[PDB]
Paper text:
As a proof of concept, we used this platform to identify both known and novel L- and D-amino acid peptide binders to the well-characterized model target, [name]. All peptides bind within or near the biotin binding pocket of [name] formed by two surface loops [1/2 (amino acids 22–28) and 3/4 (amino acids 42–52)], and by antiparallel β-sheets involved in an extensive polar interaction network, in which residues Ser88 and Thr90 of β-strand 6 play a major role. All eight L- and D-peptides discovered in this work bind to the same pocket of [name] in distinctive binding modes suggesting (1) the rich malleability of L- and D-peptides and (2) the ability of [name] itself to adjust the flexible loop to accommodate multiple peptides with diverse sequences and conformations.
The HPQFE amino acids at positions 4–8, occupy the biotin-binding pocket of [name] and adopt a rigid conformation, whereas the N- and C-terminal amino acids are exposed to the solvent and show significant degree of freedom in the crystal structure [Fig. 4(B)]. The His4 and Gln6 sidechains of the HPQ motif form hydrogen bonds with residues Ser88 and Thr90 of [name]. Pro5 is crucial for positioning the Gln6 sidechain within hydrogen bonding distance of Thr90. The sidechain of Phe7 is involved in critical π-π stacking against Trp120 from a neighboring [name] subunit. To explain why “secondary” binders that exhibit higher affinity to [name] than the commonly reported HPQ-motif binders have not been previously selected in random libraries, we assumed that the HPQ(M) motif contributes most of the binding energy, whereas the contribution of the flanking sequences is relatively minor and multiple flanking sequences are acceptable.
Residue numbers in the entry:
A (entry chain K), C (entry chain A): 14 to 135
B (entry chain L), D (entry chain D): 1 to 11
Write the structure that this text describes.
């Protein structure tokens, strides 16, 4: 009923496949535009499993740490946003990408950006 | 130049 | 009354000296913790020159582009925050540092962080 | 290693 389980695509070629559990869990995989095994990472997060019924979106967030069995970029991204249902459902998000740094390099530790995901590729 | 895996594109 | 004109210091040792104009202008200089002429850059911004009288802070923001007559880091930082008056006045901020990039490197264009400024050095 | 001017420190 949540509308969130399934495959989502951002506007630059990445794909994530998630299950929205009855308990508020988000679990799945995030795959970069490269599209290989090396390019797939574990995704884990949470969502509001009882959203408002007034037309408001469904709040959610998730994390990917950029380590898999093939590669490690010593970093993790969090996406914070909301699911917006209807004819062309969307997940609108802002993200923070933190890389592990020394204290001297902490100034350059955290990048910020945004993503919009749809159930259909760009 | 290295592109982080979040953003990496096919070659 | 406004409380903003003067010298402010962040927790890293940087120093800014600002004038808060009657018209809402912020003008001054930002000097990194190194403290020399090559470390000083023009600061320009805006503030609420008629803040609420209910104990709220005074909203403000400013920009430094990291070019001076000595050096150019092809980047600019904005700080967004509010002035909080009282016994130990503070300016609490969040910042965005954007570097000029190619389109392919735009993913790493914008760093985010925070700064707390006080009238006394840390 | 290069530290951006916003953050550079005294040696």
């Amino acid at each position: 009923e949540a509308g969130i389980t399934g495959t989502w695509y951002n506007q630059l070629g990445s794909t994530f496949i998630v299950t929205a559990g009855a308990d508020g869990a988000l679990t799945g995989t995030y795959e970069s535009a490269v599209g290989n095994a090396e390019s797939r990472y574990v995704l884990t997060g949470r969502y509001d499993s009882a959203p408002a019924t007034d037309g408001s979106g469904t709040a959610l967030g998730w994390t990917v740490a950029w380590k898999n069995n093939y590669r490690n970029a010593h970093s993790a991204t969090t996406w914070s946003g909301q699911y917006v249902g209807g004819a062309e459902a969307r997940i609108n998000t802002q993200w923070l990408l933190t890389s592990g740094t020394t204290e001297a390099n902490a100034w350059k530790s955290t990048l910020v950006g945004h993503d919009t995901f749809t159930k259909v590729k760009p | 130049e290295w592109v982080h895996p979040q953003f990496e594109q096919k070659a």
